[PDB]
């Protein structure tokens with residue numbers, strides 16, 4: 001599995017579901033799990049998107065501080081889904097705040113963090129295939 005195209009296809013979906021235009025069960029599983037998670041934490045996500053205050057030279061710091069605080073006490077599948085949902089929120093806010101080019105950079109950050117800081121736990125927990133067996137259709 002290529003973590004890059006997982007990020008690209010998820011980000012493309014999250015932006016297309018908002019009106020912006022930017023091997024498959026994993027993408028559908030991440031889609032369903034992320035949509036349910038964003039619905040369950042709608043108030044927390046509304047407060048998060050309101051207090052983001054995205055600027056070109058603060059987006060990476062806000063992204064990092066939330067990601068490391070999310071994975072500070074370990075990794076699980078739910079925190080990975082929240083990681084994906086958080087990236088989608090940051091891409092939507094980037095498009096929302098006259099900063100569409102930021103989407104590309106965000107996609108490179110997610111890919112990098114997946115390839116360098118989550119690939120070990122994922123492989124040591126059955127990989128993305130185990131993610132689809134547990135919470136996928």
Ligand SMILES: CC(C)c1ccccc1[C@@H]1CCCN1C1CC2(CCN(c3ccc(C(=O)NS(=O)(=O)c4ccc(NC[C@H]5CC[C@](C)(O)CC5)c([N+](=O)[O-])c4)c(Oc4cnc5[nH]ccc5c4)c3)CC2)C1
Pocket residue numbers: 032033034036037041044045048066070076077078079081082083085086135
């Ligand atoms: C806005 C905010 C919320 C936020 C977002 C992003 C980053 C930071 C934040 C904020 C900023 C500061 C604080 N911070 C929040 C604090 C925080 C709260 C949340 N918290 C966590 C951490 C772990 C779990 C936890 O249960 N994990 S699990 O057991 O591995 C796991 C269990 C079930 C599933 N799927 C079941 C499936 C779903 C699809 C269906 C319906 O079709 C079929 C059934 C998955 N799964 O991967 O799909 C993994 C959790 O609960 C759920 C409950 N159900 C979920 N369903 C999808 C994800 C998911 C997560 C919340 C992590 C810590 C994040």
